[PDB]
């Protein structure tokens, strides 16, 4: 009938996050643990049935069959493991129920922070002047894009 | 083996009919359509418990689906509507639980409907040099590249340096932004960043090039804005 | 193995309707006629020793003669008869190789009540409470469910003769459920079939599976290395099934729960018999006394029979200044008869 679970989470790189995830159905045959990186299709991680842990690699999940509630336990966070991590249960009957997915937004580890604004140079090739924040860790017509170095774009016509 | 589905990018004009095909090479007897959109989980389609057998899902409204081979498993729309937009997912799984059975997703299917096919455009790319003060300071060169005024999105970036593609200091933007977020039809822009060490962008004879991949319209369509690859070069400089 | 059938014929009462219960035989393979008249046969059923039973009705049987012809594989002659408190949920699958190839049917307390064969592939109901209390868009997904376990029961039939050797007709069964202890504790059973012989056995306590032969030994192999499957199968049995059970009772606790007793009839031809008909539930007790102890030499007993109404019947016979008398339980409730002496 329906399940639950954070649409996104922050965390620094090498780092240990935690995503809950809790349930209401009909009936439970297992559950189910799926990593969706951005712009691709999904793959499995875990599956669950008899309450307890269970633990692949540096990705753990556990069960609570009574409480409905599981957790995705990821320990020592690397860059490759942001993604939308989907979590779903099979009903009463075989079809399987999807929760729509917790996206993971992994921080970059930065030892020494240099931050800085610089203005590129024009290009051949376009009108439009740039800057670029790095390093670190609203007009009419003014756009910003959002982020081992963090960045950020700002162009105006 | 894995899971084949085809195509990976589409446009159509409400009320066209089209076709998504997918393959199957791991031998699985249970076959799956979905429909992923923003804000909320895998809805199925339609699905083939075995061969033969085909039953409608949560959403079957505005669809309709084949088993052709054991392998293959075709979904079709007859209609084309704007609320069908959306990415489309192919599974299989060895059977219908037989409850650990994971599913086994294919690329994806990017599908877009319009009313009409005037706002397509393909996108406008430029490279912007590294910033003297950065090379300066940091000692180290960042390129900065935009693509911009691209309708609908579909769009592939990457960073080619001397004629071969490149992934290390790249930092492209998740998803693009829209020009004019106010409208309905706001174009699109995205940006991408290459980072490389002073020493080689200071050397003219280095090669940065910006590549975006566009899907537009097919050859044998009516109307382009069609499928192409706009790019943007920047040489080193001393 | 093959299994000779059992064979009584007798009546829903002391008009009439004139049964004929063949029992405990295999292959499912059997022709049943009552004589000829036009008899309803009643759809194929499967019990938990692998064996087969099947009852066909049509007899106010007088100044006439009426019997029942029966054609099996164990049978040179096909053999003709003359007249003369656990709850607990079961699911049966039936592979054939040639009536129909794959055949399901789930039964409560011995009831029938879910059935599914491969000819026409549909789940309809066996019992009046499903059809009414079960959406009509539930027996959808088990059609669709079905049609994959009929495919997936296919296969693996194909891979045993290959792996065992033969190929023509042969049978593959598989039995899973639960039952719930008047205590209630519970328990939960998963066993498959080969020819009526049992292959192999799962055991949720140590989730694992026993092979009964070298050849489903080799299965065993690729099951439990699949151990989240094992996993997947001790929720369902120990939590999904008891759930599923105690649904249907609820639904059913209308037929179930009711109590009918027997009307004992004695009768002599040397030989004394006691037939109890039209009793429910069917739990009873019948044997013969004499003076006033329970007798045991030269005693027959019939076993239970359904009687067609949902009803059943059985019988004790005794062959010979004693008394003698049938005592019967049944809500217990101990009943007498005196017959002779
Ligand atoms: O709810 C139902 N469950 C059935 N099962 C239960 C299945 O879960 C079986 O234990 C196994 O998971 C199938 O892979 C077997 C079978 C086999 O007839 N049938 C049913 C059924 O009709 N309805």
Redesign the pocket.
Known sequence: QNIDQPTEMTATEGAIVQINCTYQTSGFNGLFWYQQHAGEAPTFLSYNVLDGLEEKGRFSSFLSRSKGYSYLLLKELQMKDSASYLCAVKDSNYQLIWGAGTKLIIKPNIQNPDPAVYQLRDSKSSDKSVCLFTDFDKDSDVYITDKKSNSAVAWSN | AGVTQTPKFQVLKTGQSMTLQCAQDMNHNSMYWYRQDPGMGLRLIYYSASEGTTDKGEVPNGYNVSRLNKREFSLRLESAAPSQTSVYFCASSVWT???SGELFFGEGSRLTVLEDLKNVFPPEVAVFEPSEAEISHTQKATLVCLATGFYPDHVELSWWVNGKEVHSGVCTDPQPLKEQPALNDSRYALSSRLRVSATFWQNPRNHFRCQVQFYGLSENDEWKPVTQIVSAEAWGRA | IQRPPKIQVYSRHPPNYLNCYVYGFHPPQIEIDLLKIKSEQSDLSFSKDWSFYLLSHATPNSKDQYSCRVKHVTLEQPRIVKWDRTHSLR???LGISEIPEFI?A?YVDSHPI?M?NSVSQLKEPRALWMEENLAPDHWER?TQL?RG?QQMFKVELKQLQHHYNHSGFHTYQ?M?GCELLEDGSITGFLQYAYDGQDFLIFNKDTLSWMAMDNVADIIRRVWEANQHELLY?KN?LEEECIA?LKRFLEYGKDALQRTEPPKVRVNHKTTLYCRAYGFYPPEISINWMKNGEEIFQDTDYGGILPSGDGTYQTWVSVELGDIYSCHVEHGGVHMVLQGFQ
């Open positions: 639980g037989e409850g | 699911y049966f699958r399901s789930g879910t599914y088990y079905l376990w598989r899973i199968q369902w599923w």
